Write a protein that binds this DNA or RNA. Structure first.
Lengths: 46, 271
RNA sequence: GCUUGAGUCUCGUAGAGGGGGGUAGAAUUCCAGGUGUAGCGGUGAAAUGCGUAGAGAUCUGGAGGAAUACCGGUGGCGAAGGCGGCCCCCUGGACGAAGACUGACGCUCAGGUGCGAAAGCGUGGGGAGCAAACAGGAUUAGAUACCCUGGUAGUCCACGCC
RNA sequence: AGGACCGAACCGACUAAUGUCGAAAAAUUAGCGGAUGACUUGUGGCUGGGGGUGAAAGGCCAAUCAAACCGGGAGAUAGCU
RNA sequence: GCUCGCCGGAAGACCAAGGGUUCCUGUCCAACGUUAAUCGGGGCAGGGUGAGUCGACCCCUAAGGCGAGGCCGAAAGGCGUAGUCGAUGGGAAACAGGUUAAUAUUCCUGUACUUGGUGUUACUGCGAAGGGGGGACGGAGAAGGCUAUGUUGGCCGGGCGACGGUUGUCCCGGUUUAAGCGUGUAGGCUGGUUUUCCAGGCAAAUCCGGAAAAUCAAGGCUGAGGCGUGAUGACGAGGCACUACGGUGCUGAAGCAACAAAUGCCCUGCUUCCAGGAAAAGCCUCUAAGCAUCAGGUAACAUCAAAUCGUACCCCAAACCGACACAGGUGGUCAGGUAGAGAAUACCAAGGCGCUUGAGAGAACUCGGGUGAAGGAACUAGGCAAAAUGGUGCCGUAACUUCGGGAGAAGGCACGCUGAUAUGUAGGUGAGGUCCCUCGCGGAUGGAGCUGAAAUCAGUCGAAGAUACCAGCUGGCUGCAACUGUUUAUUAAAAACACAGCACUGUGCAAACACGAAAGUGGACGUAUACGGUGUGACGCCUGCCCGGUGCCGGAAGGUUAAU
RNA sequence: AAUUCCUUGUCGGGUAAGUUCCGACCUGCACGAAUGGCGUAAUGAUGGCCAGGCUGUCUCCACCCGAGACUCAGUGAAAU
RNA sequence: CUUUAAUGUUUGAUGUUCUAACGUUGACCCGUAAUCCGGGUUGCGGACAGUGUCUGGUGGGUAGUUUGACUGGGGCGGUC
RNA sequence: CGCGGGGUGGAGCAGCCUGGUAGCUCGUCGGGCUCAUAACCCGAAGGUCGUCGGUUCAAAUCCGGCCCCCGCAACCA
C-alpha cells in the first residue's frame, strides 16, 4: 500500500505556497480570510 | 519493395515490412532540424480535443521545402532519406549555388539526378513550375491553393493531381478523391507522382505497431455507458440506435460540408 | 576422315509472332446548357421501368472506359493455346539466293522443367458497355426458364496462383 | 530479429490458509502470471466537479464517486420517527 | 567478557527525498517504552555541522507557467509575441594518509588543479541581440583489449601447537598506494595540403558549403589501461612502552609474480534493424555597425579573489509516509569466499543484530510442520489443499499444421570418489632466449611456469551419487476468445476490453470534429496511400432476401408554410 | 449448443452405476450470416469431462516437533 | 367584365460585370533581432462570406419535471 | 384463473364493425376438346355461418353460458 501523502517541499510550495496564492485574485481572497480569522500560520512555508 | 516476415513468433506472423534499399542508412542532415512537440491530443486548455492520439515515439521535425521559391538553378540529388513525419520519402538535394534543402521525393528520382524550378525547366519529374506552362493531361502534386502559398494538395505517397482543362485564368484539377476543383493558374506544382507508393501495402501486424506510431487504444461505443456515450448500457449488447458520434451527430451518412466561401470552386462531388 | 543428315556465317523478303511506351477515329452511358413536346422504351401482345419535376428526338461541349467497321479472304504467323487501327523501341522464329565451313555435334525421350483460352482466387487500381447471381413484369397448370426493364461480382490493367 | 521461451531484482495479484475488536481501515505465508516490451520507475509540470480521465468497470479524482471535499444559501423541507 | 544462534545482492555501508538536533557527553526515572530499567531516539544543561575543487545559488534551455504591448471577453479573466522563469538535462576545477566523545574529498601534512580581475614584458588588429562548427544524443546484438576484485605461489613475521600424529607438499596473519603530469599504446574515425571562383549562409565574411585544379601520400582528432613519476612519502602485521586500565605515545620487515575475470571502463564506440532517436549556452571561429600613437586578443610571469547557503544524525527505518517504537510502502550507488549458469540458493567474511515481556506445564482445542501400515479420489460442488515431477549431456518423440511449430511432447540412459590416457589432455594465457626494424607501450619465432573442462577405461563405497536448499506434473477430448497485453485500487482477471486486419462513411484544408461565451489551439507545421466517427474483431471458406416502419442521401414541379 | 422450456429428449461410446462429458439424428418453445456465421495451428494463473502418476483428501484417523491455550509475576483493553 | 398592346411609373425575383465595404490562417516591407499583432503595397475572392436582431424547422447533446388511487402485500386483470 | 381473436359448402379465406340480400379461388359433377390424360373452354349444384338461449320486425352480425383451437400472461422474494 502506498499512502496518500508523499512529501515533496517544492511541490508543496508551488501548488499551495504563499506566492501562488498571491498571484491570483482567488488566492488573494483566501489570504484575506486568513487575516480575517487571526490565524498565525497564514500559508505553508519554512 | 514489399517483404513478408516469418511466422517465428505470435505477433510477427502477420507483419509486412516495406524494404527500400535506396534509402540513406546514414544519419539525417543536421542543419535542418528543430524540436517538434508531441501533444497527446490536447489544446491550450490541455483537455483532449481529439482522442486516440498520444504516447507514441519521439520524432524530429525536418524543414521541407514545399514552396520551391528558388528559380532556374539546377540541383544535384544527394540521398533519399526516410522522413519520420511523412508517409512519403524526402530527397536531400543541393543546388549549384551551395544551398541544401529537402523536397518531397517524387516517383521517378534516383541518387544523383538533376532538377530545377521555374518556367525555364522542361517537362521532367521533379521540376516545379506554374500550371499555365504545364501541358494539360499531365500528372502533378504539391499543388498550391493561393499563388505563392507553397503547395498543399496530394503530398502523400502515390498521390497525384491530374489536370483536366485550362479555362484561361483558371485551370481544372481532378483531385485524388475524384473531386473536381478549380485553382488560379498562377499557382505552382511539381511534375510526377510521389514516391514510396507501397506505403499502402504495409500491414502493422502487432498491437504496439500502432502504439509507437503515436496512437492510443480505441474503445467501441457498445462497450461504454449511457453517461459516457450515446450507445452502451443494456444487458448484453443492445444497440438499436442510429450510430452517432460521442456528441450526438448522426454518422455513417451525413454531409457536414459547410464552408460556403469556397463553394464556387468545387465543380464535382465525390462519386 | 568424307559428305548428300544436322548446325553456322554474308545479303534480302513477308507476316494479327511476343513485350513495353504513346496516339487516333466512330459509337455507347452519364453530366451541364439551349430549342422543343406528349409520349419514350419493348414485344408474339403487353407490362414493370422512364416522362408535364419536363423525358425520348435534336444541337453544342466536356469527362471517361472498353473493343478496333471497311481492308478481311478454307489469307498469314507461332510449338500450342492463341494473335488483327496505327506508330516508336527491344526482339524470336520461318523461307529463298549464289557459295564457303565444322565434320554425325543426330532422332526420340519415362522422370523433370517451362509456356499454357476461358472461368475462378488473392493484393491494389479503374469501372462506358455487356452481364452470372438477384429483384420486378409477363408466358405458363407451375416458370426460382426461354423474353423485357434494371443490375453486383466479373469482364479491362499490373504482380502472383490455379 | 522476436509485443520469443525457462527464470531472480522489479511490477502485477489467480488458489488456499491465517487474520476479521488483525501486526495492517485488503496484509502475511506456502504456491503463482509477466519478466526487451502495449515494460517498469524517479523527478517536474498540465487536464477538475454536470467537469476531468478512462485497453470502458458507470471504474478513478487524497481510505469517500450513478456526480468529491470546504464554506455559504440554510435552522432547506418532511402528510414521517 | 566467555560461548551460542540469525541476516549476509542484507536485517551491511553510503546519498537524494523527507524529517528537524532525534547525533555526542554528563546526569535524572515521576510521565513516554505494552514487564522491571542505574537503559534509550524520554526530561534537563552543555558540545558538535569548519569547503574556490561535493550539491544548491550561478550560465543555458525542454514540458509548462508568468507575460510589456496586442487580440478577445458583461467584470473577474482567457490566449499569446518579444522577453523572462523553470531540471530530472548539458557547462570550470582534489586525491591519499592521519586526527574527534560527535564533523570531515571541508581541518592538518604531502602533492596538484580550475575560472577571472589588476599590473608587467614581448608580439598583434579587435569587435554583437548576426552566420557556421561543435555541444548533440535511438533500441538491440556480438567481439576484442583492460580494471575493481579474488585465488595460488614467492617472500616476510610468528607458531610447531592442553587426546593419537604434524620441522614439513605444515598452519595463521600481511603483501596497500590515488588526483595530476609525461609517453600517446590496444582500438576507433577520416584522405590531408595549396591556388582560384561563386545567384549559397535576412547584410558581410579569410569560417562553413559548393564547383574546377595542382601536389603528396599520409597527416591529424580521439582514447581506457600499462610503464615511469607522484613516493629514500604514507600505510603496514607484530613488538616496545604508560594505564584515569577506555586507549595513547614510539618503532616498524615483506610490499613482487602468475592466473581467472566483471552487468564497470575504452563504448557519449562498431555492425545491424526500425518505431528513425532534445534545445540553448560554455567553448572554437568569421565579420557588419564602428573604434585604431588606443582599446582589446595570443603567450609567459607575479599578486589578489574564488563570496552566500546546506554539511550533524536517521536515509529498505523506533526518527520518512501509514493516528502507534506498526510483519506494509520508499528511487540510486559499492557489492567478497566455496559450491553453483546466476544479484537464485546454501553456509560464512566485513559489518550489524537476537526482533523490549518472561518463568514453568506439556490438557482438550487451534495454527505452522514431520511420518504413516492396507487400499489409493471411495473425499467432494470440484483432485481445493498436500503429495509427487523437478538439473545437465545425450537417445528419442504422435495427431494436426498458418509448415514457425507442436516439444523441454511422452518415455528413457549416464551422474559420487580414486588412479590411469597425462608426476593434469585438447584449449587459453604467456616470460626468458634468437632475430629484424619505418626504435617503440612494436612484430615474428620461441616455449617454462600457471590454469583447466570434458571424454574413455579400470577399481572401490552406501540402501539411495541432480543425494541438501534450489528445481516442470503429464497425456486424451472439448466450449469461448486468436495470441502478448488491460480492467472492477479494497469480494468478479473472465468467454469482458484492447488488438493488427477488414468494411462503411464524413472531410479539398481557415477541412471535417472537439475545448472555449470570443480570440486562439488541437487536428497537423500532416494534407485523401491523410485524418474524424461507428461496427466487427487474427487467419481460411464465405458474408443470402427485404426500402414497408425509423434514420440518411438526392431532386425539388405542386399543396402548405414564420418573420417581414 | 454460453441458445432446447417441455427434458435427466432418443440412440451409440465411456463406468458395475454417467441429470455432467463426447459423437449424431432434427421435434430450432425462441441459431444464423460485421449487434457477423461455421471452422481453426498455436496460446490461456480460463469452463466442463476422462486416464496415468501421486499421495491423509477419505476409509478412521494415529504419534511426535514447535507457537498459543493452563498456572505464576509485571502491564493492562474491547464489543455490551 | 374578359382578353391584351405601346408608353410612363413603381418596386420585386434572377443573371453578368466592376471596386470602394469587408475577408485575406497568399507573397513582401516597416515598427522589430518577434512565425502574435497593427499599418502600408500587391494579388485573389467579392457586396457574397461572416456577424447582430426577428423567425420556421431538427433537436435526450443538455436541463427542470410528470408518470393516480382502491387493492384481503405488490404487480397484472378490473373498477372509479 | 385472466385478456384479445377465431370456428362460414370438402378446403383456405372475405362479409360482422354500422342488423333485412352470403362472395373469391381451388375442389366436384355433366358436356366439349385430344386417339386417351392433364391443362384450357361452357354451365350448374353445393353453406345448420361452433352450439344453446335471450333481446329485436329481422341475428353470421348485439350480448351471455359452454366446447375446441391460437397468441399473450403465469412475475418480485
Amino acid at each position: 500500500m502506498k499512502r496518500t501523502f508523499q512529501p515533496s517541499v517544492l511541490k508543496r510550495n508551488r501548488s499551495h505556497g504563499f506566492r501562488a496564492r498571491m498571484a491570483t485574485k482567488n488566492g488573494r481572497q483566501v489570504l484575506a480570510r486568513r487575516r480575517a480569522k487571526g490565524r498565525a500560520r497564514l500559508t505553508v512555508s519554512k | 519493395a514489399v517483404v513478408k516476415c516469418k511466422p517465428t513468433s505470435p505477433g510477427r506472423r502477420h507483419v509486412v515490412k516495406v524494404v527500400n534499399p535506396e534509402l540513406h542508412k546514414g544519419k539525417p542532415f543536421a542543419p535542418l532540424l528543430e524540436k517538434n512537440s508531441k501533444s497527446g491530443g490536447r489544446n491550450n486548455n490541455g483537455r483532449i480535443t481529439t482522442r486516440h492520439i498520444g504516447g507514441g515515439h519521439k520524432q524530429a521535425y525536418r524543414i521541407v521545402d514545399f514552396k520551391r521559391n528558388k528559380d532556374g538553378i539546377p540541383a544535384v540529388v544527394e540521398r533519399l532519406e526516410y522522413d519520420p513525419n511523412r508517409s512519403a520519402n524526402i530527397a536531400l538535394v543541393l543546388y549549384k549555388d551551395g544551398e541544401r534543402r529537402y523536397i518531397l521525393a517524387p516517383k521517378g528520382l534516383k541518387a544523383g539526378d538533376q532538377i530545377q524550378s521555374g518556367v525555364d525547366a522542361a517537362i521532367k519529374p521533379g521540376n516545379t513550375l506554374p500550371m499555365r506552362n504545364i501541358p494539360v493531361g499531365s500528372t502533378v502534386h504539391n499543388v498550391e491553393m493561393k499563388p505563392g502559398k507553397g503547395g498543399q494538395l496530394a503530398r502523400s505517397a502515390g498521390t497525384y493531381v491530374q489536370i483536366v482543362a485550362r479555362d484561361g485564368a483558371y485551370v481544372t484539377l481532378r483531385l485524388r478523391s475524384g473531386e473536381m476543383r478549380k485553382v488560379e493558374a498562377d499557382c505552382r506544382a511539381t511534375l510526377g507522382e510521389v514516391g514510396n507508393a507501397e506505403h499502402m501495402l504495409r500491414v502493422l501486424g502487432k498491437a504496439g505497431a500502432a502504439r509507437w506510431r503515436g496512437v492510443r487504444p480505441t474503445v467501441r461505443g457498445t462497450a461504454m455507458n449511457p453517461v459516457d456515450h450515446p450507445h452502451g448500457g443494456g444487458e448484453g449488447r443492445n444497440f438499436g440506435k442510429h450510430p452517432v458520434t460521442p456528441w450526438g451527430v448522426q454518422t455513417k451518412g451525413k454531409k457536414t460540408r459547410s464552408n460556403k466561401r469556397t463553394d464556387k470552386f468545387i465543380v464535382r462531388r465525390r462519386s
